[PDB]
Amino acid sequence: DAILSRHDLDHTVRAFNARRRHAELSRRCLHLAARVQVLRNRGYALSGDEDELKQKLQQIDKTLNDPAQGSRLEELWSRLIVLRGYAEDLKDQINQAGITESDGLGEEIEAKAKKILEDYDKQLQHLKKQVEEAKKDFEEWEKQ
Amino acid sequence: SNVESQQEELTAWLDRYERELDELYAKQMGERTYKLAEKLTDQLDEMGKDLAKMIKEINDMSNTLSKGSKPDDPLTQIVRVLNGHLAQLQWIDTNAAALQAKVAAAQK
Amino acid sequence: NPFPGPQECMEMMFREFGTGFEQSNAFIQLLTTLLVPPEGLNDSVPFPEWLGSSIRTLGIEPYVDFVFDVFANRTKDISDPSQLRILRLSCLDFVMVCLVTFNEDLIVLGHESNISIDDAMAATNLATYVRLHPFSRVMEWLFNEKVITSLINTIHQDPISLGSASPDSPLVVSILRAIQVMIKALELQETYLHLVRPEVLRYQGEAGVRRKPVANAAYSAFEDGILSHLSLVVDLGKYCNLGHAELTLACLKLLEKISTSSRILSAWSPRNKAIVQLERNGEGETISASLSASIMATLDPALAASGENYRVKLAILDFLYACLRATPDQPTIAHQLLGFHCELSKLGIEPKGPFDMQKSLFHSLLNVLITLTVSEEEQGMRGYLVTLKYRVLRILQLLWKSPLSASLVMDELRATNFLFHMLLREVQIQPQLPWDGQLVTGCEFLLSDASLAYIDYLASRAAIFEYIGKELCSVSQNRIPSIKRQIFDALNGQIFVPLTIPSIFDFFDFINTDYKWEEIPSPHFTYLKDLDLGPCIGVHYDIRKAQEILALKRKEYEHSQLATPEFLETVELEEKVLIEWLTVRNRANLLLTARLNLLQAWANLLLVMIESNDFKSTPKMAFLLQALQAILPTLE
Amino acid sequence: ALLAESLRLFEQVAGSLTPANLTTAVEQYISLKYYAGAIQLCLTVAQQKDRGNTALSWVNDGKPANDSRKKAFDERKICYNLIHQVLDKLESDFAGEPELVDGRPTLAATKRMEAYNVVNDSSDEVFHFDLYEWYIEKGWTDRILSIDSPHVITYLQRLAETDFRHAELLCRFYTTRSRFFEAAQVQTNLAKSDLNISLKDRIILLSRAKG
Amino acid sequence: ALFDSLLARNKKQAEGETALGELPSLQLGLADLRQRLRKL
Amino acid sequence: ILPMYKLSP
Amino acid sequence: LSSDILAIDQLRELVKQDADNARLSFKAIDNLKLSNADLISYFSKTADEMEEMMKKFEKTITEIEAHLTGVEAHAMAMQNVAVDERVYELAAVLREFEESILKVAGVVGGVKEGVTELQLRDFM
Q1: E-strand spans in A12-123?
Q2: Which end of chain C is more exposed for a tag (fewer CB within 10 A), N or C?
Q3: Residue of B16, B25, B31, B63 to mutate when probing chain A, most A C-beta within 10 A
Q4: Which G positions 77-116 lie with beta carbon below 8 A of chain C?
């Protein structure tokens, strides 16, 4: 209980918090790392590999700043809201089968299914780690 | 705590650099492309966030539609865990296939 | 120049028209109406190409930019919930009117063949269309966190309000419009990111344009911004108990598309989050109960294709099919909805649960399937019943083939005598019984939709034969004659509860060469004879590959200036015959592969029956001779 | 040593020789029986006027008229027409002469084999097509058949599709090599065609295809 | 508490966040999932 | 357990 | 806890590269107060990285489309229709997962043995 209480609350929050702090500090780091390449390198002689950088930047920027690509999301959202309203309506209509649902679901096979699931999880973890090892052990041979 | 204090030294210093930065500004007083690069790199984060919101809402609608008189039930539980297993199994399969492919290279 | 530079006066006026709700909604409606073309709801984007060419403005973008900024920021100053709902509905309608006015196939064919095959003249037209159309700006805004946050806040509402609200309530309409916008965005995100972003970036780099980004680079796709919301699926599932057909179908389609994605299921199951989110207060149980109560609702015989109940049933079946076909090895929400305990790489059943008491979604499907009669008199061999049973059988096969959910399913099936119900529901096929009032020998049969129902019935028979063979093999390897006797009796043509049924040899009526599905009457085709189906062709002959060729040939003939007006009708009728020729060839190939699969299944069943048979041979000599007589003409 | 070094000097400025000089060179090479060499110069001058191989992308697309790539084909052909010019005086000088005294090949027959190895081995297939087109115009039928290059199969296959009398050779090409099925495969597919062929010819085609 | 942790993990999984890549994945289940499994 | 699944027509 | 390990492991390598990238920036300023060719790789790297994140966005979008298109059908059937039948589904799923795992296992074993083959051929 103590271990679980520690993990489930004290550590999870610090993990997430630390990750967001990393992201923020990554942004700040790039911002500074960007200004450094501005003020000091403002000697007008900025070229060479810059072209390639702004080429890539222009390519990705052009790919992003498209009407269709930007429009697809907006279309999708409404396209979702349609189903939202439709589903909510059709749900409210068939919002009567509650006892059948709760009692229908509550059963015994569920307990067995949970067990089978845990077993699957174990087998899966084992396989995953086995493959991981198979990779790590191969990248060795990749050098020799 | 180490990872947590590393986000204290490498923050106070990041704040410390700003003085030498303002000093550099002070020196220069006596670009937009990068500023475009940062916003360009930053803009997609919002898209990721919005996309995440969308996915969450879709999950909400599907889950609530399929079942909405007992959200604390063991069905959606099995569904979710079982999805997890599906994903992990897919990962295993794909990566294993990749390693299998990697061996053909050694078959020279 | 409203009586100060124009760039400032325009924004001042926009902000002045932003204070309040009445004027804002009126301006939004006016803009939406103005964006409609005069021909009604494809080229000639509904606005002048020289709109704002005098001043240094991006055209019509400022309008959409201000609308999005308002809808994203100033939605908190509205106290009256009705005003907020009306404003959100107006914004969603504006977004839909802006998105539906975007050409997808046109831009695809342009980027494909315009610069690579066609000249560079029309390229400028498509470039101007893609640069001036506001679809790109809408898509860029869709990647913002404010938009998705407002959307999920609008969709996240208490259930009591929707329950007490009227079907024409603005909340339901706004939710429907939002779901439709989300669907359109999920559909067009790929097309945008492919054929909009690079062109716009290249244009901005070449020419001089000042634009402010409003998208997040981190959100590489639309799913990244919505994968952080867990209550969305819960709300979508709870909204299924409302009865609204349109809203229910929209929510089902949204959930299907979500389950069909990959990044969402990779983030959920990298333990898991959805299974625990749907098992907080028994949401899965009530969702399954509502789905069961819905599928059990009868349909209107008159409104076969218009019955909203049948549409909801088909939507639920398609959702289940898509959720089970994707990632079958790893469990999903479908297993939880069916009444299984989704565990990590393992399943199970709980005591006294809904699935243990034979009251769940799977048992409801079994019941509605065994209590379904397709044999009718007025028409006979209906189509939508066939489609429903075909979908049910596909779902059953997907559940069976999955080894993670195979043993328990087979046990539950053999514990209720499902094969017996299926056999009792079987019906014999003959060349006299018409399909939906239409006879099979008619030439229009290959062109009508009865071919789909016929293929579905063939696949159903094949699946039933495969299941019977698998169950017979299982009972034989289990070395228990308690069920072998009943199996043989069902195969002999008798049932001891005696009820008789047609033997397996009776169902061997699908092999018939009188129809001549292989032979096809080839017209004269005095012209277009050299046009082959090379680029048309998984036997699937595309019709557009030949349509483009015949169109180019007609254009060349017209340019030749040799009796172009008279001989045009000949080419027209030749094309109208070639399209039906292609459709008939496709239908014939489908029927042939279906017959092949059915024959393979029947042969496998017969082999499994003959091999695993401890009963005497002298009594079965009659059936042996009958099978020999039946196959003699087939081999000949 | 003089002609071999002259050839080295010409190939260097190949991407820059004027048709007037290239001719004067080939004219002299023929006087000195330097057949195989002169052919190699013209082939080399061709490739260096069009390194990107636009005469291929021009003919492969099939007769794009009113095009800038006409330069590529036309300039390449000035060299090809000279190759044809050499191959004529080759046979003329060694006209009807046998390829051997008993045991020993003639040096006349050697300069013949040296010449037709440069031609048959070249990787310029636009040159091969223009060469096969010119062999027919001279009635050298049995010459096309003997060629074992795979550029001849593409030429004859692409011409059989719209010319009955060229599909004839492709069928003859296969039958001298004893690829009998491949011939009947064309003869049958030709009788079933949409081409302007008389019925009594289609009777011959199917009768040969049956054999 | 194992299956519980499996849920909890698979729950926190499909819920954000700002991790520079890992966005929440949509859950399927049952019908679509079986086919999605078979398409492996 | 089988109220309606019985084969009693 | 084992799941918590990978969390820190990620957080470890993250702050470490952020430590270096924030360090590479100060040494440039400390050099100035008393590397321009180096940060180019860093920016181009961020670009190269994001270049795929966009593709991920496209992928997820296409999936979302493909999914909601299914949601439509599910609702389209659910409206049209308007416990024990779905219990069979769970079993049908699990018995199929067993098979899928057993399928994957073969691939894994094949790989592993395939690697040990080369490992052997190395010192053999």
Answers
A1: none
A2: C
A3: B31
A4: 77-104
